[PDB]
Amino acid sequence: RGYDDWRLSDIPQYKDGISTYEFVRATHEADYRTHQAEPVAGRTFGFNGIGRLTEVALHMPTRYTLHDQSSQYKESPSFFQGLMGVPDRGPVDLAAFQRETEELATAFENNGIKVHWVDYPEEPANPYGPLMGHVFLSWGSIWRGGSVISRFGFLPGMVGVSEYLAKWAWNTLNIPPLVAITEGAMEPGACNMIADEVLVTCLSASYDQRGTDQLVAAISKTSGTEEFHNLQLRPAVEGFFNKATGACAHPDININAIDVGKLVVSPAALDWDARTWLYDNNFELIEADPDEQREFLAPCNVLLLEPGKVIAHADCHKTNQKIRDAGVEVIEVTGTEIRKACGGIKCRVMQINREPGPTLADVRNRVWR
Amino acid sequence: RGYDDWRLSDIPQYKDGISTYEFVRATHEADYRTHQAEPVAGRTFGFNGIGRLTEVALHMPTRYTLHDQSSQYKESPSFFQGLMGVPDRGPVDLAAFQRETEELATAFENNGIKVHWVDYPEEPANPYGPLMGHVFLSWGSIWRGGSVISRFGFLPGMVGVSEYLAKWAWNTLNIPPLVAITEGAMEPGACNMIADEVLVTCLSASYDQRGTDQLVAAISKTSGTEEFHNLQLRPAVEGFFNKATGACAHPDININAIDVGKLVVSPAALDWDARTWLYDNNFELIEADPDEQREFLAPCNVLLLEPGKVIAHADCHKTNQKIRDAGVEVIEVTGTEIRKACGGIKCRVMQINREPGPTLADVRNRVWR
Amino acid sequence: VAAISKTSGTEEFHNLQLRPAVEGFFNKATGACAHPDININAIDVGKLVVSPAALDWDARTWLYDNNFELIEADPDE
Ligand code: NA
Ligand code: NA
Ligand code: NA
């Protein structure tokens, strides 16, 4: 459209004969997401909900991506093994890690999902040491309304990284920032949603109440939904993972939607209040295999491509058969090397755009019991 | 520092023998501004307070910087004159506008202040028309903790512009975003501070309570101060300016600090509650000349370089003499072309860095009455 | 708690409430239990034996702030 072709009618709040007060008031009442954020970006964005995923980002590992090669890790493996708490399966193999990355990218491409690639500098470091955990791009997933700078609860190696990803999103995709978390802890990208307006968080090493309150207040305003619900799990774990039980600080390892009103869920996830809430709101629970969970094969860490279709770890044979039995298509992808650190396949995916999908009302209205 | 020289002692929360729980808790308790925002940026930043200004940005006008060249302005001058409410002083002259810009830059250089330059594209437009008001870079001033995306209450021509300035600050200076305002109206860069922890806002066309609450909550957490105060003026004005009275929607036209516990203030600014608050907190008021105020010569729009030294419009002879009588040095700078739109000299300056300066306690402790 | 607090013989009364992830009495996948007596117990003044499956973050914080020392039970046992 030509620079000299613009007219007052191109301003949505403008009307012939409108008073100053009325124009201003209409401006104050406009919706931020649809009036400002999306039009200025030139596109929709946000991974909220359980609708159709269209766009993601991955990181192709280099030798600097490997947590066990940080000089700080070398100084004290046991310090980082306490923070992470995941089973020791030996050193990360770079070549195999690269191969499973290619396989994940192909799964997306075979299903019509756009894949962007995020690179980091050589010898990447923040003020406190080498980057660590920066393969886990879910930590930079984009909300309706914009990107978030996180406060990491347990991993100093991620300082600077949510900044880098948000900046990448702005420069590469024109997606703006929504908020920085500035108190307590909050790692929103490791949260997930089980309906269009239902967020699952934890209280854990990765989330306190103050951080949660700040994040939820910001994303609720741009959620595109009338109401917003936060189901808060209360896992018994000290760091990231509890290898005695399968309990995890991140929702993405405890629970995930596989279809409308159907969740895959860890044995270690549901305290009584959470169970009651899910029951009352008509969610059907597919229980993950207990050994798969406890051994950190990440059977709940499935990525929903759309209701009824997920990407899952190829070696979660028992959980994946239960998911298929629930009428859901499973795309199996190798995820052996990724699980040597604090996450699985879903955890490594930055979700950029998901189309609007089924609501909590749709969950409540499904007749299945 | 070498990539392989990092040790655990480089992590501030680390200590020999610390448990996982204790390390995580120390991480949750760390201060965002000094642990994350500033170290990742590689520098301090923020214009908060009344200390020494060190760094600003200006825009050198082009033909597209002129509001009277927008096709929307041409379609209805009276619409925009209703929104703005400022006296008509005739057409902007590009070349003279450029000249007064160079004069302001020289004043900054003569006073030891670093000046960055912001350019816009040719034929710059947002989703709703040509940019308008984009010379006024105060709207992009940087807070302790980071940049802000604003919700403009009356000027659709600024949609997209606070985004552009924040992105510029991130790419050019490595300064991160703090928050996007997503409800109501809030134009924080046209606010000003009268002590290290005292923010002056208005309730007006440019600010509602919801927008104010969002902004104040965000900047208070990174203010670097134990307490934070918001003095809210209640000007009687419909749009930007009330040409019958001198009242303005923006604090920056109503009031400004000139020294520790000394303010220049418009006759039209102080409702009884605001006057009482200023009295109880020991602020001395220098009243701007009423004719200079009403004629929009912007006599309260002075830029504090440090306590006791301001830049002011060269033609505010009466107010400037009152400021000098109060023991403050005035640097007079031409600001004729800038005032044809909704702002004065201070309004066109993006403040990037101001050193920590006197506190509300310092104001309260000054003995002068 | 209202009933026993009035006859406790003590000026104050505190209830630490654990939130175990278990559907019935016992969770054989995790070691979590519906009963406190299987999750935690005092062994001396300010020293507790405690299950890996017992302590949510709020409970852990409360115990830490009140100076209780935790001996972790063997996870397989
Ligand atoms: Na719960
Ligand atoms: Na000032
Ligand atoms: Na508890």
Numbering used by the authors:
A (entry chain A), B (entry chain B): 11 to 379
C (entry chain C): 226 to 302
From the study:
Mycobacterium sp. JS330 produces 2-nitroimidazole nitrohydrolase (NnhA) that circumvents 2NI activation, conferring 2NI resistance by hydrolysing it to nitrite and imidazol-2-one (IM2O) instead. The initial characterization of NnhA indicated that, unlike most other known enzymes that degrade nitroaromatic compounds, NnhA is a hydrolase that functions without catalytic metal ions, molecular oxygen, or other cofactors. Despite low sequence similarity and limited occurrence in a few soil-dwelling mycobacteria and Actinomycetota, NnhA maintains the α/β propeller fold characteristic of GME superfamily enzymes and forms an unusual hexameric ring structure formed by a trimer of domain-swapped dimers. The residues in the active site of NnhA appear somewhat conserved in comparison to the ADI and DDAH, with the catalytic histidine, glutamic acid, and cysteine residues present in NnhA as H260, E197, and C357.
Using this process, we identified a variant of NnhA containing three amino acid substitutions (T2I, G14D, and K73R) that exhibited a substantial increase in soluble protein production in E. coli compared to the WT when analyzed on an SDS-PAGE gel. We isolated and purified this variant protein (referred to as “soluble NnhA”) with a yield of 8 mg of protein per liter of E. coli culture and compared its catalytic activity with the WT protein. With data close to 2 Å resolution (2.04 and 2.16 Å), the quality of the electron density maps was good and showed unambiguous density from residue R11 to R379 at the C-terminus. In the unit cell of the P1 space group obtained for soluble NnhA, three homodimers are arranged to create a hexameric ring, with a large pore in the middle. There are three dimers found in the hexameric structure, and therefore each protomer has interactions with three other protomers, including its dimerization partner. NnhA also has an N-terminal extension that makes extensive interactions with the adjoining protomer to form a domain-swapped homodimer, the presence of which also distorts the first β-sheet in the proceeding ββαβ motif. The third T2I mutation is not resolved in the structure as it is located at the start of the polypeptide near the N-terminal His-tag. Both G14D and K73R introduce oppositely charged residues that are located such that they could potentially introduce a salt-bridge interaction to strengthen the dimer interface. However, the minimum distance observed between them in all the crystal structures was 6.2 Å, which is further than the expected 2–4 Å for a salt bridge but may still be relevant when the protein is in solution and in a dynamic state. The conformational flexibility within the oligomerized complex was also supported by the crystal structure, where high B-factors were observed in surface residues of some protomers but not others.
